[PDB]
Amino acid sequence: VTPVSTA
Amino acid sequence: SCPTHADSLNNLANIKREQGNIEEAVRLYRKALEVFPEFAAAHSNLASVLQQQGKLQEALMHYKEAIRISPTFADAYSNMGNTLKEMQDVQGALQCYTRAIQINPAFADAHSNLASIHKDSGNIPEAIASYRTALKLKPDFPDAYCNLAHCLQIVCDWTDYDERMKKLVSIVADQLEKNRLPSVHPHHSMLYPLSHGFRKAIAERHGNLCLDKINVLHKPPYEHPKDLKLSDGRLRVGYVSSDFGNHPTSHLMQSIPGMHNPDKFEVFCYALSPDDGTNFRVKVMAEANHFIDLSQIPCNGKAADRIHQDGIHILVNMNGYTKGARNELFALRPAPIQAMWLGYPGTSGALFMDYIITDQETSPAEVAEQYSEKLAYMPHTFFIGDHANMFPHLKKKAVIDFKIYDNRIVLNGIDLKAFLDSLPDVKIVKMLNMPVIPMNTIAEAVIEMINRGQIQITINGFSISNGLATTQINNKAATGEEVPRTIIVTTRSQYGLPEDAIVYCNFNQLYKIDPSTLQMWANILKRVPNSVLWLLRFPAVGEPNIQQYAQNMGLPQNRIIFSPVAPKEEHVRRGQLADVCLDTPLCNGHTTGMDVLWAGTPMVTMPGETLASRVAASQLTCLGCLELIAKNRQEYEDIAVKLGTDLEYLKKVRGKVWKQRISSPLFNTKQYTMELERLYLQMWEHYAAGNKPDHMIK
Ligand SMILES: *OP(=O)(O)OP(=O)(O)OC[C@H]1O[C@@H](n2ccc(=O)[nH]c2=O)[C@H](O)[C@@H]1O
């Protein structure tokens, strides 16, 4: 829902 | 027909595989299976090298066969699972892992793999549980240990922290020296005290995973252009990202493709992900000279072809090792110059990347040895944000006096001025300058809306909206896809912050905090009495852990206040309520740095050694606030404490940020693009002169 930089 | 013949060919292929001659290993495995088709281990082995080669469709078929032949082959279930996972079939992958565990309750790997699915889904306690099981079953398990270490990091469990770190470093050291793929992920490697040529080597080693997957395409080197004649005097830049859509990277650079000068540049945007329907994706599509949907071209060879045939001079990697990346495209090397930019905060370690776009404060030349790429310097900061464009309603504010504080009750809105002109008793405090509504009947109606928790009110025909209810008023405005069309009230009381306190905030995800950082903050909080710390439930399960270590450090529960994660616009906006922001030194706030600075909230930072720990300093340098950059932990605490105790100095610094955020180059996307353009042209002049990449440090 709240996007983040992910590996 | 002979099983002993077949067995030999398997042993011979296992040998060719240890020496990384994967090419030949396959040929042998395949002959082993032509001899004896019911050979379980050959099927399994062939499958796991096809998986390395990215030939997942076919690797799966051979795993299925391995199982058919040897139904108790727990190990083959687990690897099939991994193949299905890479094929985006998480449902069926999970079924494989569970099925392995039923067959062999004692088999560690399947437990670990199951934990990996849980981690990816965001359910972290269940991930921890399963990792722990795996480690009980197999106490020497680097993959599971490091993955668990990361989960613990995420929830801020710091049990046996110092010993845990020494072990990670130890595990990586051992794997690097035994020429194995490290268990720590490059995108995590900045969080641990790694021996740093280590971080570079971990990255390098992930780069190799691509080489293996592109070799099977047997593509000859591409013929790169050597002038700008075909491209009509224009330098062709391709941006490659999986994040043209609702993603931090788009919140930083969505305005840039449109700002390129069309006389000298032709801009291609290569999307790695389908249209998510958001305005961020709309804009890029509408403003880039060319927009190319590579999610429709899933084969890496055909995609690289397309890049080459479009005629790109500089290909920009905005992904590094983040989710969605397809570095195989860069490994194929379809453009003469290829640069890392913005989206990934570290080196790629890979040979196929030429430059990293950074700056002198983030990556000083002293530390060039951290990066495998050559450094290319932007003149101020390589960081940029779209806040001027996304949130112009926060360019000016106004307050309500409820007894002159700039952060207790705050109004923002495009039509704020017009509303204030309809009010009788507005006082104008000078700094621009800040209007102050006095406590009249109007002020009370606003406060009542906030207290009763109502959506919105009307006053003199203007719409006044409750800051906590914006997704109900206009959902696109909440996400940052539209500028809000109403006046928006934001108050401390909304978030349970004490009206008359010094508020120190940090809005980053909790994984960026470590026991030293929390110690530092506890120090600051004791020295500035009445102050509070403002953190997010990011994730919520991390909260009780912090509360715990906080009380251990002698801070009553009430000195740290946790809020839920907000929609993008509310999140940026509510930074205005803070007094100072305390930046995590382990891994800085990046997008979050820009977000807190746009609210005009000063931010104390302590630049570490890794790129990721220097970005905040770099942002502040550019803004022109050297007094917020600490040389050490003692200095950090001191700056923070001064800001909390010396109210005159606070007002001065706060005012300086509020002003500089417009007047400095930090949020100026036009100037940024132009600087970036100059940098591109340097890189090209250099290449066209027949040179291999070297540092562009101006
Ligand atoms: O790039 P960073 O490392 O600085 O940021 P992350 O990758 O950790 O992701 C943060 C994203 O989450 C947004 N955000 C923060 C708090 C909140 O309440 N809502 C919210 O949306 C940040 O804006 C950033 O995009």
**Which CATH number is B32's domain given?**
1.25.40.10
Which DSSP state fits B511?
G
Nearest atom in ligand 1 to B568's CA: 21
| Closest Cβ opposite residue B188 in set A2, A3, A7 | A7
Do B271 and B369 fall within a single domain?
Answer: yes
Do B227 and B344 fall within a single domain?
Answer: yes
* Residues of chain B contacting residue A2, judged by C-beta atoms under 8 Å apart: 565-568
CA distance B209 to B52: 8
CA distance B686 to B133: 55
C-beta atoms of B509 and A6 within 8 A: no
C-beta atoms of B343 and A7 within 8 A: no
Chain B, nearest residue to A3 by Cα: B247
Owning domain of residue B342: 219-385+662-698
Contact between residue B534 and residue B561 where contact means Cβ atoms under 8 Å apart: yes
Candidates B570, B550, B597, B556; CA nearest to B495 is B570
Assign 3-state DSSP to chain B and report helix, strand, coil percentages, each to 5: 50, 15, 35
Do B162 and B59 fall within a single domain?
Answer: no
- Sign of torsion, CA B251 B253 B257 B258? positive
CATH number at residue B352: 3.40.50.11380
Which DSSP state fits B696?
B
Identify the residue among A1, A2, A4, A5 best suited for mutation to test binding to B, counting B beta carbons within 10 A and taking the highest.
Answer: A5
Assign 3-state DSSP to chain A and report helix, strand, coil percentages, each to 5: 0, 0, 100
| Closest Cβ opposite residue A3 in set B248, B321, B343 | B248
Do B568 and B642 fall within a single domain?
Answer: yes
C-beta atoms of A3 and B246 within 8 A: yes
Contact between residue B410 and residue B652 where contact means Cβ atoms under 8 Å apart: no
Alpha carbon distance, N-terminus to C-terminus of chain B: 69
Which H/E stretch holds residue B412? strand B409-412
Do B474 and B459 fall within a single domain?
Answer: yes
Distance from the A2 Cα atom to the nearest Cα atom in chain B, whole angstroms: 7
C-beta atoms of A7 and B509 within 8 A: no
Resolution for this PDB entry, in angstroms: 3.2
Distance from the B210 Cα atom to the nearest Cα atom in chain A, whole angstroms: 16
Do B476 and B531 fall within a single domain?
Answer: no
Instruction: Determine whether the annotation assigns residue B17 to a binding site.
Output: no
Ligand 1 binding pocket mutation candidate from B323, B591, B594, B595 (most atoms within 8 A of CB): B591
Ligand 1 binding pocket mutation candidate from B592, B613, B618 (most atoms within 8 A of CB): B592
Nearest atom in ligand 1 to B507's CA: 16
The two tokens of residue B317 are 């990697």
CA B35-B40-B45 angle, to 5 degrees, is 90
CA B648 to chain centre: 36
Candidates B329, B371, B336; CA nearest to B350 is B371
Rounded to the nearest 10 degrees, the angle between the axes of helix B74-86 and helix B40-52 is 30
CA distance B684 to B138: 53
* Residues of chain A contacting residue B188, judged by C-beta atoms under 8 Å apart: 7
Return the active site residues of B: 187
Measure A2 CA to ligand 1 centroid, in angstroms.
Answer: 8
β partners of residue B487: B464
CA distance B599 to B622: 16
CATH number at residue B392: 3.30.720.150
* Residues of chain B contacting residue A3, judged by C-beta atoms under 8 Å apart: 246-248
Contact between residue B29 and residue B46 where contact means Cβ atoms under 8 Å apart: yes
* Residues of chain A contacting residue B343, judged by C-beta atoms under 8 Å apart: 5
Ligand 1, atom 22, lies closest to the CA of B592
Measure B591 CA to ligand 1 centroid, in angstroms.
Answer: 6
Question: In the PDB record, what is the listed experimental method?
Answer: X-ray
Measure B571 CA to ligand 1 centroid, in angstroms.
Answer: 9
Candidates B575, B592, B564, B560; CA nearest to B654 is B575
Do B157 and B234 fall within a single domain?
Answer: no
Beta strands in B492-569 (DSSP E): 503-506, 532-536, 560-563
Type of residue numbered B278? T
Final residue in a domain of this structure, among B218, B240, B264: B218
**Cα–Cα distances in Å, from B587 out to B168, B513, B606, B615, B618?**
18, 8, 10, 9, 13
Ligand 1, atom 19, lies closest to the CA of B566
Chain A, nearest residue to B569 by Cα: A2
CATH number at residue B564: 3.40.50.2000
Which H/E stretch holds residue B581? strand B580-582
Do B353 and B234 fall within a single domain?
Answer: yes
C-beta atoms of B188 and A4 within 8 A: no
Is the shortest distance between the CB of B591 and ligand 1 below 6 Å? yes
Give how many domains chain B has, as a whole number: 5
Do B276 and B338 fall within a single domain?
Answer: yes
B424 C-beta neighbours (distance < 10 Å), count: 8
Final residue in a domain of this structure, among B500, B527, B545: B500
Inter-chain Cβ pairs, chain A and chain B, closer than 8 A: 25
DSSP B178-200: TT---SS-TTTGGGS---SHHHH
Is the shortest distance between the CB of B246 and ligand 1 below 6 Å? no
Do B283 and B355 fall within a single domain?
Answer: yes
Measure B685 CA to ligand 1 centroid, in angstroms.
Answer: 37
Is the shortest distance between the CB of B592 and ligand 1 below 6 Å? yes
Contact between residue B578 and residue B584 where contact means Cβ atoms under 8 Å apart: no
With 0-12 CB in 10 A as exposed, 13-18 as middle and 19+ as buried, what is B298? Answer: exposed
CA B387-B631-B505 angle, to 5 degrees, is 40
Rounded to the nearest 10 degrees, the angle between the axes of helix B542-552 and helix B515-527 is 60
Type of residue numbered B410? V
CA distance B407 to B495: 13
Final residue in a domain of this structure, among B500, B528, B558: B500
CA distance B18 to B3: 23
* Residues of chain A contacting residue B565, judged by C-beta atoms under 8 Å apart: 2
Rounded to the nearest 10 degrees, the angle between the axes of helix B591-598 and helix B615-623 is 30
Q: Which residues of B480-492 are buried (b: 16+ CB within 10 A; e: fewer)?
A: bbebbebbbbbbb
C-beta atoms of A7 and B246 within 8 A: no
Nearest atom in ligand 1 to B247's CA: 25
C-beta atoms of A5 and B249 within 8 A: yes
Do B138 and B227 fall within a single domain?
Answer: no
Strand B487-491 and strand B409-412: the pairing is: antiparallel
Type of residue numbered A1? V
Do B400 and B347 fall within a single domain?
Answer: no
Instruction: Determine whether the annotation assigns residue B196 to a binding site.
Output: no
Determine the length of chain B: 698
Measure B590 CA to ligand 1 centroid, in angstroms.
Answer: 8
Measure B252 CA to ligand 1 centroid, in angstroms.
Answer: 11
